[PDB]
């Protein structure tokens, strides 16, 4: 609630030269090196104590900020976030002082930042070669799990002739990292088409996206090979028919099609009329590869079908465009304003900053600029991010003596 209110009362800027932003970047060094600071922002050097509750170096005076290695610490978006997310620190502190037994409490932002309260150095990816900080909060299970409602994907790989070579390496990596953004409440099945559609794996319907099924789908996807002419109509018939199969267990929600193609000149208007007429099924289309084929039909299926269109032209574009599809799916959850602010607890997982088995309670945070002076609401359909407060399993085991 504080984050929503504070963001609603933040005015955009581009001038952070004299009106700086001061913050502690979790991936700094302990050495008093003023060459560790930044043009647009000024860095806190904190006094770290050692705690046994966390097992690390804590400092309850401010909240650390983690910014992915791909994202510049001083772009305009990040500096605006580093500004308006500084009231979160005093709310963090008052939360802790009410209950001293509280673990990490983090705001994971849609800009990639994570601001977590008990300020600790980033675990193992601050500064050491041969280990790269691949963390990105917008992919963490609690974030994926608070940023949308459960899915029913069907991933339509395009294994035809034209995707052989690099595009196929990128398609199988993209589909691996698309399956990686799936919970146990989400159902998935990978289908592939070239002049006729077929499953890549043994599953003939939407199966649950748990560790074992996801491994089977990944190991099938990595075995896939490119050959033959493309048929979008016969592949989309398969996709739409597998999302109408209600005899199986399903997350009867958010039906999606993730079309991983490169490009053609087929729009399949008739099959989108016959199968997705009232537009219950979204269609996200990905244009993988460094190529030159036409992208008009691909950019058009997404528009026609409530989807979105992403271009994945190289590795290193793989990791962002998936969490982007989640960026899209959260519109209906935003629009139903306060029926969607229910705290949800994640499956047990291992904490990024090492504390072992922790479930985590999440709550999406909405964008509230134009309210009671109703305005255009350009991007008032996205979430700012997800709040998440951890609970340790050792903490629950103490209530079961």
């Amino acid at each position: 609630l504080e984050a929503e209110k504070v963001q609603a009362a933040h005015q955009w800027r581009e001038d952070f030269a004299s009106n700086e932003v001061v913050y502690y970047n979790a991936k700094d060094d302990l050495d008093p090196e003023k060459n560790d600071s930044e043009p647009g922002s000024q860095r806190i050097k904190p006094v770290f104590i050692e705690d046994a509750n966390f097992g690390r170096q804590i400092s309850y005076q401010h909240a650390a900020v983690h910014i992915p290695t791909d994202i510049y610490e001083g772009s305009t978006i990040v500096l605006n976030e580093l500004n308006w997310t500084s009231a979160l620190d005093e709310v963090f502190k008052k939360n802790r002082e009410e209950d001293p037994s509280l673990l990490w409490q983090v705001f994971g932002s849609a800009t990639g930042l994570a601001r977590y309260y008990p300020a600790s150095p980033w675990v193992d990816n601050s500064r050491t070669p041969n280990k790269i900080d691949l963390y990105d909060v917008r992919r963490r299970p609690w974030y994926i799990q608070g940023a949308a409602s459960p899915k029913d994907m069907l991933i339509l790989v395009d294994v035809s002739g034209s995707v052989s070579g690099l595009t196929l390496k990128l398609i199988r990596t993209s589909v691996s990292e698309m399956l990686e953004t799936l919970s146990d409440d989400d159902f998935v099945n990978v289908a592939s088409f070239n002049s006729n559609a077929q499953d890549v794996s043994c599953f003939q319907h939407l199966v649950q996206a748990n560790v074992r099924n996801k491994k089977v789908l990944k190991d099938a996807v990595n075995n896939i090979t490119a050959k033959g002419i493309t048929d979008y109509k016969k592949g989309f018939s398969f996709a739409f028919e597998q999302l109408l199969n209600y005899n199986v267990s399903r997350a009867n929600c958010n039906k999606i099609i993730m079309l991983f193609t490169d490009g053609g000149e087929e729009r399949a208007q008739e099959i989108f009329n016959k199968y997705n007429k009232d537009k219950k099924v979204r269609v996200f289309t990905f244009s993988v590869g460094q190529h030159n084929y036409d992208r008009g039909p691909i950019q058009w299926m997404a528009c026609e079908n409530k989807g979105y269109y992403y271009e994945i032209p190289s590795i290193g574009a793989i990791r962002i465009n998936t969490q982007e599809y989640l960026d899209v799916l959260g519109r209906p959850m935003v629009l139903a304003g306060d029926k969607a602010k229910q705290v949800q607890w994640t499956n047990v997982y291992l904490d990024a900053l090492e504390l072992g088995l922790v479930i985590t309670g999440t709550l999406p945070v909405f964008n509230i600029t134009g309210q009671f002076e109703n305005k255009t609401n350009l991007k008032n359909q996205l979430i700012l991010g997800v709040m998440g407060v951890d609970v340790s399993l050792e903490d629950i085991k103490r209530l079961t003596p």
Binding site: A251, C253, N254, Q299, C303, K306, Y309, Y310, A336, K339
Partner: peptide, 19 residues
């Protein structure tokens, strides 16, 4: 057993941001 409530398919949703 799956989650009780899930949000898709609001009519107010703004579809005009494909890319």
């Amino acid at each position: 057993k799956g989650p009780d409530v899930c949000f898709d398919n609001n009519v107010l949703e703004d579809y005009t941001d494909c890319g």
